[PDB]
Each structure stands twice: as C-alpha cells, then as structure tokens.
Design a protein around this ligand. Structure first.
Ligand SMILES: C[As](C)(=O)[O-]
Ligand SMILES: C[As](C)(=O)[O-]
Ligand SMILES: C[As](C)(=O)[O-]
Lengths: 261, 258, 261
C-alpha cells in the first residue's frame, strides 16, 4: 500500500482562509510539492477579496514535522537551470511572510524542524498546551535556513537561539512560550473555542490598522520614513478612523469598512 | 479638569495622571503639561527619582477619544501636525534620572506608550493592559510601535497590535510589556520598597547606565563610554561602595548630577 | 592561616572540557589571575582536538560572586605601562565568547555582578532552580562593563536591562528566566541528571551544524553574506548531512563525523 499524497489545501468561509498542511502519513512533513503549493497559494490569497485573514494549521492533531527527510535535498538544495539551488522551504516561508493580510499559525501536536520556520512566517503562533516544538537541524547535520535562523535570533535573542539550535531539544508549549517561540498557549480543553474567538476578533478589527501595522512592524529595523509618512497620512483618509471614533463614543462595536486595493 | 500633578518628597517626584472621569485618559493639555514638567524635574536638584502613576486605582486609558485628533493630529501653522502624546513620551524618555511607571487598573491604548517611556514598568497583578489602535481604526504612533517591537519582538508585537486584546498583568509580563508583577495585597508596600532601593543605589551608576543603555544600538557611543568609564574611579561612589561592602554595611553614596 | 588560591581548572573527558571556577573562600569570586587564566585557556581549548564541548561551572554549589571586591581595581582598571588600563574580566569574557566550540554555563547558587557576564559569554545558561542572579554595579558605584552591558541589553531588552541594572536586585532563577537572563531552569533534585543529559546531547549532535550555527547566530546583527554562502555550500560537502538523513530513515541515532580543521 502506497501512502496518500501530501498536500496543502485551503478552505474559505466568512473572510477566513484556512490553510491546512496535510500529510498525515509523515506527520504533516513538507514535501517539495507542498512547498511549491504554499508558494503559489499565498499570493492568490493576498489578491482574493473574499479573504481577510489567513489561518495556518495542520491536518488532524499535529502541525508539521518539517521538511520531509526522505526528500530533504530536493526541498533545501533543489538544482536550478542557472546553476544555483533553491531552498523551497524558505521560499514558502517568504511567500507566507509577504502576505499583507493577517496570518496566524495554530499549532497542535508536533511542530518540528522547518515546521517552526513555516509557523513563524505567520504574524504569530498560538499553541495548544499539549503541543511540542523542536528545531532539529543539528540532529540531522544541516543548518537552519537563513531567514528562519535570523527570525529566531530576533524573536528569542542570541542565547535562547543557541540553546534551541545547538541542543535540538524538544520543548513543551509552555517552555516554548517562555523562550519566545510562540505568542500564546491555550489549554487543550479550550483550544478550539479560543482560537475561533481569536479569529473572530481579527475579523472585527480595522483592516486599515492591521495592514498598516503589520507592514510597519515588519519594516522596523529592516525609506522606512516614507512608509511611515504615507501610512500616517492615509490614516485620517481611510474611513475606519471616523467609524472607530464614533462607535467608541456611542459604546458600540464598530462596523469597519476599509479594504485592501 | 484633567491634569498632571506632582508631589516631591525625599528625592522622589511622584507624578500623577489625574483625569478620573475619563479613567485617566490623556487630553492634549495633559500631554503639554508632561512635556513641560519633565525637563523641570530633570533640572530640579531636589529630585533624584521619578515615579509615574495614575490617580485612584487606574493608570491611563490612552489618548482621550473625544479629542483624539487634537492629541495625535493637532494641526500646526506651518501645515504639519503634531502628535502631543509622542512629544510627551519623548519628554519622559529624555529624563536623565531614573523613572518607573507603577501601573494599576487599566493601561489602554497610548497609556502603554507613556508608561514604557519610563525606564521600566511594575504592574499590580490585577492590572490590565491592551494596545487598541486596531479597535479604533488608527495606527500606534511610531515611537511607541518601535519601542514595542524592540521590547517584545516582532511576533508578540503583532499579536498585541493586530488583536488589540486586553491582557492581564501576568500575561503582559510573559509578553515582555512590563518588567514585573506584584500581587495586589503587597503592591503598595513592594513599590515603596522598590523606590527606597532606587534612592539608595549609586546615582553615578544609575545616571551612567541609564544613558549607556539608551544609547545602545542608536564613535558617538565610544566617546560616551570612554568619558563614563574614566569618570567612574574619579566619582566618590566607587570608593564608598567598595569600602561599604568590605565592612559589611550599606553604602551611603554621594555623587550628584550637575 | 592563608586562603587557598583561587584558580580556573579544566578537566577533559569524552570530548567535554569542564572548566571550573574555583575560589570557594570568596564564593568563587574572580581574581585578576583567574581572569588571566580564562583568557589563556580558551584558545587552547579551541585548538585542542580532544575537546568538542566546553562546560563552565563553579566549584561546589555556587557559580561566581563576580570580580573580587577586595581586588576590584586590579580586575577592572588594571594599570598598564602605556598609562591605559585593562579590564581583565572583559578580556576573559571575550576569550570565552570567541570559542568556536559550543559552551554552556551551569549556574548553581549565586551568580553575582560580573558572574553573569562570564556566564553569558557562553552560548547559554542553564540554572538550578535554587540559584540566584543579580547584576550589582549600582550597589558598588561602578558601571557594568560594556560587553556585558550590551549583551544584556540585547538579551533582555532595554526596559528589563534597566530594571535589572538600576535596582541591582537579586532574582531567583525562575525570575531570571522570565527576564531572559538564563535559558532554562531545572529543579534542584534533577539538576545533575539533566545537565549531564544536556551535555550528552550536545556531544551527539552534528558538530558541523553546531559550529556553523553558533558562528552564524553570533554574526546576526554584528561580510555576513559571504559566511552564509560558504557555510551553505559546505553543508552538503560535510559528511554529517548524509549520515543524519540515513540515520533518521533507518530509525537510529546518527554517528556524526565532521570535525573542525
Ligand atoms: C535563497 As533561494 C536560491 O532558495 O531563493
Ligand atoms: C510633528 As512631531 C514628529 O514633533 O509630533
Ligand atoms: C577594553 As581593554 C584595553 O580592558 O581590553
């Protein structure tokens, strides 16, 4: 019996695109094809006016075991006609990081190796208490790809990054949180309810605010002055500020209107 | 009627954000008062330490929403606009003296920006913190956004700003938004002892390190290090500290600014 | 009765160099001679092919009480023939931080003043739950040396660094961890077992991976493009990647082979 093929699927409802990493026979490991699919899918979701928020999640009760080891060179060192190589896992990471819309990773079960790199490409990660996280290049003889390694260092600092990468240890979700690898941890019995509420919240906020701030955060410590001037000047011209002020003063929830162009 | 008040005793300037009807929201006038007050405190030889807190049991609800444009987008005769909340922030962050924010109750919107302009924040366990520009359709001002990103990292900053969620003080601490959390029953006593501690440390050490920390990651910095390192043994505090330690007693330090 | 002289010793077994700060009469405070010994030793350890990992630990049940206060000027302000002064504690710190091999500080008991500086020059710190950490220059009227101050600022952020330095408070290990001063905390009853397992882990990982990543982490936000290109290109030429892939696919532990040249 041959395994069911690994794939990245998407389901869209109420402005939320649920992107699922589905390769359960390999604990949701990423194949080269899966990386290519993410790479193609993220710009389509960014252009789709029916999508306001992206949610990234593993099929079943596990997030992602990393690049598939049985095809590791094709994922990280894939030869190209011009004589370079391509790291498809990093290109997938970048496609997710370039989304202008909010993206959240919901991590349950195991998030291993390049799984964290994909998860961390989202804006932030919410983990189930029972999840485990390990970055294991050192268990395999490879190097964590540059964008992942730099992002780690910036999120958790130099010392924690070394603890994480040199030992390749597996951490519980509350440990991962203490280290800075994830933004929040939710008990298992309420994980589903809390993630659904979180998503509803992101669907209620001003999209002008979220788009602007996501972009301005991403530029911080990466010119940047021109982007700030443009966003600050767009702010009163967007309809969301007036709607937000007046909702607040009337003690009601705002019905925001700005949409990406 | 909203106002900034100050009381000075034993080298401690207690600055209070007082606008209780609006849960200590900042008006434009209040921002202008902070802006004027900080440099006076810095020049006052009777002030060693500044403590910032809210009137009653609540810290600051942010820029007053009913006058939001006046606080953040105040038009100026040359055609620019002013952000008075950021100017206030910057007046607090330019203090050369140690400044601590004591946060109880709610610290919302720009409240965190004012609090975080101090050197660090100590929160009561029952306090709540939310940064809510995304609930209003605005953008967090640049100094505050950047400071946030540098204190909590990119991912936590987005979690905080994109959701605009309200966090308990322990959660805020886990995220990096405040430096420590004290249970409610012992908050006042512990804050008072913290303040007594700052008042008994070497002021040469505090002044120097606050400044060197603030310069870290902003030739210019080399000269400041060389000047401070060279001033260190010429200040009296080092000899007083060494000898107090060896005699097993608490040092009575003497260096004073300016 | 004269005190037993403070010293830095090393013991080497199974590729681990255990470096011990031994000056128990002063709670393992560092004298000038001890700082000079660290400074001379670290490069020897880096060049010794029998050493793969360095572990830094205090004699007995305490780590380090900082520069010895009774000889503070000779450690921090040591006069030199050209009229300048030398900070031996910082030079010891730099010698440790220049190690290309993995280095871990195991902190028990007290780690005070410049003790944190020496510990934080290692890649990361594992603390016993009963350990205490305080950075106390402000209790003494001095300034934390620049490499330490900057490292602190980068590891814990500006606000936590000012809380730590301006108060000079002593923190418990779990507090120090919450602030970012140490990477992990282990209960006292299992500290020895868990440190030994940690060290065995580091001795099991790919040394190609550890060397490369340590160096790339240390370069992040410090030329860097060329280093990345060289390491990435070396990766498939090193034998460790092929050994790591096969071991994983055969469900066994890898026996890695790369060694530094
Ligand atoms: C860094 As690449 C060649 O995988 O785009
Ligand atoms: C015009 As401004 C940057 O001083 O608020
Ligand atoms: C900064 As020095 C001359 O003590 O190495």
């Amino acid at each position: 019996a041959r395994p069911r093929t690994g794939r990245i699927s998407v389901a869209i409802a109420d402005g939320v695109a649920s992107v699922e990493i589905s390769n359960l026979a390999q604990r949701n490991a990423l194949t080269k094809d899966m990386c290519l699919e993410i790479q193609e899918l993220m710009p389509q979701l960014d252009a789709d006016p029916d999508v306001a928020v992206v949610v990234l999640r593993g099929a079943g009760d596990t997030f992602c075991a990393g690049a598939s080891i049985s095809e590791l060179a094709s994922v990280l060192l894939d030869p190209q006609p011009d004589g370079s190589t391509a790291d498809h896992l990093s290109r997938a990471d970048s496609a997710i990081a370039a989304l202008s819309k909010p993206a959240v990773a919901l991590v349950d079960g195991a998030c291993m190796g390049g799984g964290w790199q994909i998860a961390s490409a989202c804006d932030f990660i919410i983990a189930n208490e029972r999840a485990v996280i390990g970055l294991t290049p050192a268990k395999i003889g490879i190097i964590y790809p540059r964008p992942g390694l730099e992002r780690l260092v910036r999120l958790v600092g130099h010392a924690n990054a070394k603890y994480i990468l040199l030992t390749g240890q597996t951490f519980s979700a509350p440990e991962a949180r203490a280290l800075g690898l994830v933004a929040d941890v939710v008990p298992s019995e309420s994980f589903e309810e809390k993630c659904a509420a979180l998503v509803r919240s992101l669907r209620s906020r001003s999209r002008f605010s979220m788009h602007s701030m996501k972009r301005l955060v991403d530029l911080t410590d990466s010119g940047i002055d021109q982007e700030w001037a443009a966003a600050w000047s767009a702010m009163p011209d967007s309809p969301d500020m007036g709607i937000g002020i007046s909702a607040f003063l009337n003690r009601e929830q705002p019905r925001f209107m700005w949409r990406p162009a």
